[PDB]
């Protein structure tokens, strides 16, 4: 079933150009073929953090943790808990450590 793994990478790549409605069409394919699987909601939560609506993604990750009760869905249980951390990650990070010279934004303390 590897086509459904490269079609979600096409979705992320389309959000990386600005083709947001074709990128949404790629998550919508997953829920079109799998209407009741939490995989499709995990890819909608991905699309929301790739369209800058992280306030929806922090709620939708809680909604997807409600799809975890069996040994069929232990991967889903990890998948929405890292999606929740990385929604808060993508909104809350600023990449400035304000100390040393290990990474930094460009310039800052090496000019």
């Amino acid at each position: 079933m590897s086509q459904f793994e490269k079609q979600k990478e096409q979705g992320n790549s389309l959000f990386k150009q600005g083709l947001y409605r074709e990128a949404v069409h790629c998550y919508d394919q997953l829920i079109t073929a799998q209407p009741q699987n939490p995989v499709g909601y995990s890819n909608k939560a991905m699309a929301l953090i790739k369209l800058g609506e992280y306030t929806q993604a922090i709620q939708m990750c809680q909604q997807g943790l409600r799809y975890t009760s069996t040994a069929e869905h232990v991967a889903i249980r990890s998948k929405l808990q890292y999606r929740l951390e990385l929604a808060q990650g993508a909104v809350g990070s600023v990449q400035i450590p304000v100390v040393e010279v290990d990474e930094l934004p460009e310039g800052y303390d090496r000019s």
Partner: peptide
């Protein structure tokens, strides 16, 4: 378990 960057 990770899915999309």
């Amino acid at each position: 378990m990770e899915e999309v960057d």
